[PDB]
Design an enzyme around this catalytic site. Structure first.
Site, PDB file in Angstrom:
ATOM      1  N   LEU A  92     -24.822 -15.848 -13.248  1.00 16.66           N
ATOM      2  CA  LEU A  92     -23.771 -16.825 -13.493  1.00 16.66           C
ATOM      3  C   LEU A  92     -22.779 -16.919 -12.354  1.00 16.66           C
ATOM      4  O   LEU A  92     -22.189 -17.974 -12.147  1.00 16.66           O
ATOM      5  CB  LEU A  92     -23.000 -16.496 -14.774  1.00 16.66           C
ATOM      6  CG  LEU A  92     -23.751 -16.626 -16.083  1.00 16.66           C
ATOM      7  CD1 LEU A  92     -22.821 -16.173 -17.230  1.00 16.66           C
ATOM      8  CD2 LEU A  92     -24.250 -18.059 -16.265  1.00 16.66           C
ATOM      9  N   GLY A  93     -22.566 -15.839 -11.625  1.00 16.36           N
ATOM     10  CA  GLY A  93     -21.591 -15.872 -10.563  1.00 16.36           C
ATOM     11  C   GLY A  93     -21.709 -14.642  -9.708  1.00 16.36           C
ATOM     12  O   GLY A  93     -22.186 -13.592 -10.147  1.00 16.36           O
ATOM     13  N   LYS A  94     -21.266 -14.794  -8.468  1.00 22.20           N
ATOM     14  CA  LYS A  94     -21.265 -13.731  -7.482  1.00 22.20           C
ATOM     15  C   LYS A  94     -19.846 -13.691  -6.968  1.00 22.20           C
ATOM     16  O   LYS A  94     -19.363 -14.651  -6.357  1.00 22.20           O
ATOM     17  CB  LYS A  94     -22.254 -13.994  -6.348  1.00 22.20           C
ATOM     18  CG  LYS A  94     -23.600 -13.351  -6.549  1.00 22.20           C
ATOM     19  CD  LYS A  94     -24.211 -12.988  -5.208  1.00 22.20           C
ATOM     20  CE  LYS A  94     -24.030 -14.119  -4.195  1.00 22.20           C
ATOM     21  NZ  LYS A  94     -24.055 -13.616  -2.789  1.00 22.20           N
TER      22      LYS A  94
ATOM     23  N   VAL B 105     -21.817 -11.564 -12.155  1.00 25.01           N
ATOM     24  CA  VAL B 105     -21.870 -11.778 -13.594  1.00 25.01           C
ATOM     25  C   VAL B 105     -23.221 -12.403 -13.933  1.00 25.01           C
ATOM     26  O   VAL B 105     -23.631 -13.398 -13.317  1.00 25.01           O
ATOM     27  CB  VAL B 105     -20.703 -12.665 -14.072  1.00 25.01           C
ATOM     28  CG1 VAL B 105     -20.845 -13.017 -15.544  1.00 25.01           C
ATOM     29  CG2 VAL B 105     -19.400 -11.960 -13.838  1.00 25.01           C
TER      30      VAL B 105
ATOM     31  N   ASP C  50      -5.814 -13.970  -7.831  1.00 29.63           N
ATOM     32  CA  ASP C  50      -6.990 -14.773  -7.477  1.00 29.63           C
ATOM     33  C   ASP C  50      -7.054 -16.030  -8.346  1.00 29.63           C
ATOM     34  O   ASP C  50      -8.124 -16.434  -8.810  1.00 29.63           O
ATOM     35  CB  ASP C  50      -8.285 -13.946  -7.604  1.00 29.63           C
ATOM     36  CG  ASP C  50      -9.410 -14.444  -6.684  1.00 29.63           C
ATOM     37  OD1 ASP C  50      -9.136 -15.321  -5.827  1.00 29.63           O
ATOM     38  OD2 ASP C  50     -10.564 -13.946  -6.815  1.00 29.63           O
TER      39      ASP C  50
END
Ligand SMILES: N#CC[C@H](C1CCCC1)n1cc(-c2ncnc3[nH]ccc23)cn1
Length: 289
Positions: free
Chosen positions: A13-15, A21, A134
């Site tokens: 799903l994500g880096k 994730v 962030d």
């Protein structure tokens, strides 16, 4: 207390910044009835990154709010190496991608709904003396068309009691085009630098993530794509010190841009609070309806 032989990988799903994730199915009964969850793991699990990851898990577990992604648990492999954080899976992905996807049916009132939810999530963070560090649309997730949640806390720090900022510099890449000036010059992070970054988030939302309009593209054009590595940040500093700012996005009303420029105050003490930001956004929302 999920354990990895019941976690079935489905996709990435994500880096992130030292982590990633994955979409997984937690299926302990092994009959494909289990829930789809999101699983965060470290990609290169050094000792420092693991202590940071444990602090990140404690932070997320201490947050309960409609606009913060829900902690579900932890996963351990033999011993306790390969630490994994289990979270609720949100099906519409990051707000950056969602917004780029549905440009044509997300109107300004919908943007201000998302904005209000982000400010309430952030005000809750501040009540806990957490600094997110962030804030960006890539770190906001969409649960459905009417709800977004702050979705990643890898850089989040707790303030010392005796201080209202946290001084920290990390090795590697920093989202410098979302950073307040005092974060660029002195590595000082505070609720007020989160407010600066929220202004950048608001800019993002009202550009609808147009590629040439991203904060990095605009800033690199304003200082020149001729700049190079760290000379780059130096020029960013000077541009911000002479009140160079991202432009008003196309179709953005003047009062929404006024909110953006108020969050981008060089004077750290003159940036609005998150409660006030939510109040003004909610009054604009009521006027539009
Ligand atoms: N927020 C945010 C950014 C984050 C990436 C940045 C840090 C590692 C992965 N990311 C989280 C997801 C995600 N998608 C769907 N459901 C989720 N639940 C928890 C995170 C998550 C996808 N990318």
């Amino acid at each position: 207390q999920f354990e990895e032989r019941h976690l079935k990988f489905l996709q990435q799903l994500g880096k992130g910044n030292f982590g990633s994730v994955e979409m997984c199915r937690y299926d302990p009964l092994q009959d494909n009835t289990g829930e789809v969850v999101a699983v965060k793991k470290l990609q290169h699990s050094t000792e420092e990154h693991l202590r940071d990851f444990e602090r990140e898990i404690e932070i997320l577990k201490s947050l309960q709010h409609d606009n913060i992604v829900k902690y579900k648990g932890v996963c351990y492999s033999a011993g306790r190496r390969n630490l994994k954080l289990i979270m609720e899976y949100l099906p519409y992905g990051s707000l950056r991608d969602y917004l780029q996807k549905h440009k044509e049916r997300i109107d300004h009132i919908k943007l201000l709904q998302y904005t209000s939810q982000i400010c309430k999530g952030m005000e809750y963070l501040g009540t806990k003396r957490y600094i997110h560090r962030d804030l960006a649309t890539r770190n906001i997730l969409v649960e459905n068309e009417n709800r977004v949640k702050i979705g990643d806390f890898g850089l989040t720090k707790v303030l010392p009691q005796d201080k209202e900022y946290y001084k920290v510099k990390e090795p590697g890449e920093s989202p410098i085009f979302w950073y307040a000036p005092e974060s660029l010059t002195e590595s000082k992070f505070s609720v007020a630098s989160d407010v600066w970054s929220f202004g950048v988030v608001l800019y993002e939302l009202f550009t609808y993530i147009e590629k040439s309009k991203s904060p990095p593209a605009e800033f690199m054009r304003m200082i020149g794509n001729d700049k190079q590595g760290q000379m780059i940040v130096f020029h960013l500093i000077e541009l911000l010190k002479n009140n160079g700012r991202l432009p008003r996005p196309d179709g953005c009303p003047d009062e929404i841009y006024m909110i953006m420029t108020e969050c981008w105050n060089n004077n750290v003490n003159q940036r609005p609070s998150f409660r006030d930001l939510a109040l003004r956004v909610d009054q604009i929302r009521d006027n539009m309806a």
